Amino acid sequence: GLAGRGVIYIPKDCQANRYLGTLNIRDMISDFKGVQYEKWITAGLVMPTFKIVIRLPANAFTGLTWVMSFDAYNRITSRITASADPVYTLSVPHWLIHHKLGTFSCEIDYGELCGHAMWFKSTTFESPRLHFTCLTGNNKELAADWQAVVELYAELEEATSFLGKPTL
Amino acid sequence: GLAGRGVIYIPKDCQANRYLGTLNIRDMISDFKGVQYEKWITAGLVMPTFKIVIRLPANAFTGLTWVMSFDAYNRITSRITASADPVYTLSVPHWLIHHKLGTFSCEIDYGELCGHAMWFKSTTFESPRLHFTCLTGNNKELAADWQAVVELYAELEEATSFLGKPTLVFDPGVFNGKFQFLTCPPIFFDLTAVTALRSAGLTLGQVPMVGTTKVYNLNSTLVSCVLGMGGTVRGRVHICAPIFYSIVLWVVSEWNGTTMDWNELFKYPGVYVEEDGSFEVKIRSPYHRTPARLLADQSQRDMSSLNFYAIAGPIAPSGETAQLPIVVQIDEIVRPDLSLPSFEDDYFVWVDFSEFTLDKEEIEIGSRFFDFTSNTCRVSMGENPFAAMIACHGLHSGVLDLKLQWSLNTEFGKSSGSVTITKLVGDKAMGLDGPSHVFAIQKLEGTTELLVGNFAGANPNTRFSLYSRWMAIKLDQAKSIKVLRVLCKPRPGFSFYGRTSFPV
Amino acid sequence: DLSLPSFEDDYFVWVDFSEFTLDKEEIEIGSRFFDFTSNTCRVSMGENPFAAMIACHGLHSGVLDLKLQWSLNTEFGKSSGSVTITKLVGDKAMGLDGPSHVFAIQKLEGTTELLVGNFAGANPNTRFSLYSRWMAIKLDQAKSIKVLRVLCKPRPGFSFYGRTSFPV
Amino acid sequence: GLAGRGVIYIPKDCQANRYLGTLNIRDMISDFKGVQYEKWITAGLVMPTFKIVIRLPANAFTGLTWVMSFDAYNRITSRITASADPVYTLSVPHWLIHHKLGTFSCEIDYGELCGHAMWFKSTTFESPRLHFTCLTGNNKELAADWQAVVELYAELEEATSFLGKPTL
């Protein structure tokens, strides 16, 4: 079920390479707080399979494409908050979000994309982030500022091991 | 085949609530004149099944939505010709016409929606109209004025009876939970807002208003037959805007205001709406039901509401300015949790007469159930579902059992005279004498039956002159009476024809 | 080894009104079975198992058949007016008209039914505001009445919820 | 699972008729907050079957007996907060807790003992309380003040009706 949520603010003039924001995955779940958050406290460690949903009004008249970057180890954050070069945002696991397709969804198997289980009380190594950036801009500015909603769905259960299976 | 036709003229700037025009159904057929019109003359009476087609260039770049209102009894015409409030246009059988879908078509079974057969030579009760109004306006004006074509298709054959089959038969203990023609007026979202809330009340028995005018309609009347309801609202949402506008809605039910915490919001059981489609939302309440009507000083938001949260959008290209309209239709309460019926199979007040100024008072009833007036005494009319059902149909027919009760103004020992019920067939001047009854005033109560109907088989909700039984109440010592109360209880099978509305 | 039941399936006293000081007296019942008060007449409440059962539950619901009886204070030949039962759905201000009933005072008795309940389905043993049927007894010549007695007899299925107690 | 909890404070000299405290059932669940509390928010209405557990060191050398009174309609609260007469505490559904038996447990079928379903956001009629009182005192005072833990276990699921089945 819904485990956490957050909001990304889109300026009326969303140009290529605009940083839109960063959501902190653990904060989304703890600020929500949360049937899943509460199951997590009891489990201690979780290795979730998240379904991420970005709710987003479909529109074919803008040309907007965004990138969601999964930055589990906080490697690109510092370098994209002023301006997000696609070389950075595309250098970690990521998904293209096309405006024409509207509401977007993907699976993040935290076991694979991340590798280590999450501890209810505090971050272990670094804090896992989702970055939202604009890859291709709108053909002309839109009528007004707007927002998109980011949602995390999961059925959190107790993790049996600290470590995932090796990506490589 | 084609039986009649007409034209609706659309202004280049078609704004919400613009009245576009009224077509008179019988005139469409007679001005055409017409293989069908000619078959009609021979038949005398017809109970058509019409296919109505509105020819209309499909266009996804305007956001225009129109309403065609079937007004068989001419109930809303006078009130929409300057400006058409959706409360009126949606209060009778109606159809949404979306510009993106282009040419529109529907069936009107005149037997059901109307109730009485049409006479080739002249209108019988009132003249059946089709109204065309704009429900949601164009995002920006179009290039030029234009027109749409309305067409009637039918294979007219001779009608065997004057009366259709009754749309509704009076029963207090029966409100199913399925609705027809329950459309909420448009809800609007500004694009200058990053998020927003629009509430729709679920106190469905509440009578809708336009300024100071009450618009009685069948749906609110039906709901008033119940104390309250819970369950799941099944409906449809229509997003009435150009392809280049879009929005994402979180639709959920809340009780007594709304939470201010976005996180709580999404812990409730709602549904997401991105585009035209159906929806099911559980009615949310501490009592699991929301009341059918409001008491004094209460607001519809104090109870259960259907809330529409804009969580992403609406968005549009620059420089659009129009709001994004959402039109909600409610089809039924599924898996309903109903309260008790508000009324039992029992009597209810029709009218109280009091404050008599003359000893001789004679109240003509005839064969009608209706609102009385008097210059010589005070009339207090009862308000209840039955009376509204009468007001919300074109025709009705049945039998009322009456109970009369009265109390004295003067000392009992000094009392004399009677409450006399005159029962004739015909009229006062040439009528035959039926079961007239003299109740000596000391009885202080009496009973009688009233036929609501006539030789044709049904009454309109207006004055009319059709041979029937005829009743009157005669008082000879009225100043001795403090109050005369008349209650009625419809006999099984009391019938209504042609759902419509009644503005006052 | 039980005795006879103390009560039969019969009416019992709910309330006696007497010693009326004003000709106009209007007693609001609404949808409740409860203890009346008045500044303008004397109220004498009945005490019996039914009333205690109402007092010893959190919620109750059902239908009461009512019998009203009265006797005159003034000479019969001089009497006028009525005991009127107002029956609405809603409230006095915006209510729909039900089976209201005008009992000429010379009838000296009348009957009616009272729904004890509301749209939610049950009443607490306190004041509350929940849409329901609504009843009142209207007197226009109360000073002519020596006593107005209201008896009630619960229809089968009168229900109680949540056993509790009631200190006074 | 555990749905809420609270604490009762026992004085070293626990005499007959000492009022020990009142736990508010809905507060226990909302202060805990709570996998069950969060399921409740989603359900709106719950008709729980609670298992109540009072954790309590078994002791055969005191003679202490307490009463837990289920006061769903807040009928005795006002009259027991200074001193709790057993006539009040035993006048609503209640359980005897004997010190010799230690940790105590019972079931409260909220459908029966209460009658109406609970609304996540606020109290409907009155707020359901558990009262803790001393029925028989300690033979002599104990060594020091102490405490007992009260716990609510339930698997909250959505209530289909407002009303239970009638107790009577």
UniProtKB/Swiss-Prot annotation, chain B:
Locations listed in the record: Virion
Protein's name in the database: Coat protein
Residues included from the entire protein: 606 to 1109 of 1109
